[PDB]
Every structure is written in C-alpha cells, then in structure tokens.
Amino acid sequence: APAAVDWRARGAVTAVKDQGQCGSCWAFSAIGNVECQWFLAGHPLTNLSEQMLVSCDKTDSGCSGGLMNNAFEWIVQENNGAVYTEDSYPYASGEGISPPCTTSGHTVGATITGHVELPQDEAQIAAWLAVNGPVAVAVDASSWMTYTGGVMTSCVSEQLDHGVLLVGYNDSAAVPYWIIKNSWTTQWGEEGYIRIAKGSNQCLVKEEASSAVVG
Numbered sequence: 001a002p003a004a005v006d007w008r009a010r011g012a013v014t015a016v017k018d019q020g021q022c023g024s025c026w027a028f029s030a031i032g033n034v035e036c037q038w039f040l041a042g043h044p045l046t047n048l049s050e051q052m053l054v055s056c057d058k059t060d061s062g063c064s065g066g067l068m069n070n071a072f073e074w075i076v077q078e079n080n081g082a083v084y085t086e087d088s089y090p091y092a093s094g095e096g097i098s099p100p101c102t103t104s105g106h107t108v109g110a111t112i113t114g115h116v117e118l119p120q121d122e123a124q125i126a127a128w129l130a131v132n133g134p135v136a137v138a139v140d141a142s143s144w145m146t147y148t149g150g151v152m153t154s155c156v157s158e159q160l161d162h163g164v165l166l167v168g169y170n171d172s173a174a175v176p177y178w179i180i181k182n183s184w185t186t187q188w189g190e191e192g193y194i195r196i197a198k199g200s201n202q203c204l205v206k207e208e209a210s211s212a213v214v215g
C-alpha cells in the first residue's frame with residue numbers, strides 16, 4: 001500500500017542465508033520468492049530448499065548459474081509443482097560444487113502452479129509488490145562488495161550478474177529506496193540486506209522481475 005511496504009515487518013520473509021562459493025544466486029532468489037508467496041497464500045512461513053534446484057534442475061547450470069524463470073518452470077513442469085523443505089534437503093553446495101540430485105528422502109514444504117514476469121518499470125513493480133508480496137529480481141552487483149550500509153544513491157548499472165529478492169520499498173524517505181535480501185550472510189551490508197535508490201533503475205533492478213504463483 002503506496003507510501004512504504006516492508007514485508008519483513010509482516011512476518012513474510014525468512015532469515016538471510018549463505019550461497020557460499022556456488023554460483024547459485026538464481027536458486028536463492030527463486031526459493032526466497034517461493035517462501036514469501038507460500039506464506040502470503042495462507043500457509044506458515046517455512047524454509048525451503050535451494051539445494052533442490054542447484055542439484056536437480058537440469059534446465060539451469062547449478063554452481064555455474066541459472067535463471068529464476070527457468071527454475072520456476074522446472075518446479076511446475078518437471079517436479080509436479082513440489083518444493084522441498086530446507087530441513088529435508090539442506091544446502092550442500094557451499095564449497096562450490098553441486099552433489100547428484102536425490103529424488104526421494106525429502107518432504108514437500110510448498111507447491112506452485114506457475115509464474116508471472118513483471119513489467120520493466122519500477123512504479124509498476126512497486127504496485128504489484130505492495131499487494132502480492134516479494135519479487136525475484138536480477139541486478140548488477142559488481143559494486144556491492146564495497147557496500148557497508150545506508151542508501152546506495154549511485155550504482156554501476158551495466159550487466160546483470162546476480163539474482164536477489166525485493167522485499168519492500170519506502171517512498172517517504174529523503175531519497176526513495178528499495179529493500180533487498182541478499183545471500184551473502186548477515187555479516188555483509190545491513191545484516192544481509194541492502195537499500196538502493198528507487199526511481200532511476202539503480203543496479204538495473206527493473207529488467208528481470210518475476211514471481212512464482214501459488215494456488
């Protein structure tokens with residue numbers, strides 16, 4: 001609802017995780033979005049498995065990268081809409097390799113039916129996020145190793161290289177900003193989060209926005 005929305009303050013977001021040495025940002029962005037969308041559909045907030053995607057999603061490339069839209073379609077088209085709990089399939093790719101996929105011995109924590117791709121417009125993305133919840137986005141995170149806190153008012157915006165999760169915004173602050181959940185532990189940034197200015201396509205935030213649809 002227009003002025004400021006923060007889904008972390010509405011019990012809709014899990015704790016910050018760690019991707020380690022694996023190039024699995026795509027899986028953390030897709031699962032973080034599913035966890036939020038599952039809660040907002042009237043279910044308890046449950047931690048879900050990124051490892052399920054890194055090891056079993058063959059339409060993406062494990063620790064060499066992927067795309068959240070291919071991950072969402074693999075869940076629906078190849079895994080019968082199932083997303084396992086993180087406890088039944090823990091992260092095992094922190095050293096930079098993805099072990100072979102195991103198709104059993106896991107528990108279904110959530111299900112989805114599809115996904116939507118959102119417009120390349122920050123005002124339109126804020127409007128959808130305000131009502132339907134957190135959105136998976138891709139950014140140029142090349143300048144993010146120097147982020148120590150506060151609102152980043154200028155960001156290098158040349159090439160998308162990192163998938164993250166948009167969890168809110170604040171249009172009433174001195175400079176309007178986006179609130180983003182990252183997967184580089186709570187020791188990075190603002191306890192694992194980053195605020196970037198909103199309205200000028202900082203870090204190319206409006207280019208690849210999408211979300212799973214559950215129901």
Ligand SMILES: *[C@@H](C(=O)O)[C@H](O)C(=O)N[C@@H](CCc1ccccc1)C(=O)NCCC(C)C
Nearest residue numbers: 023024025026061065066138160161162163
């Ligand atoms: C992100 C990471 O920091 O771990 C990881 O390198 C990654 O998945 N990068 C992809 C490119 C950036 C991006 C992410 C999500 C959506 C759009 C762009 C990546 O290399 N994609 C590979 C595509 C597959 C099909 C080979």
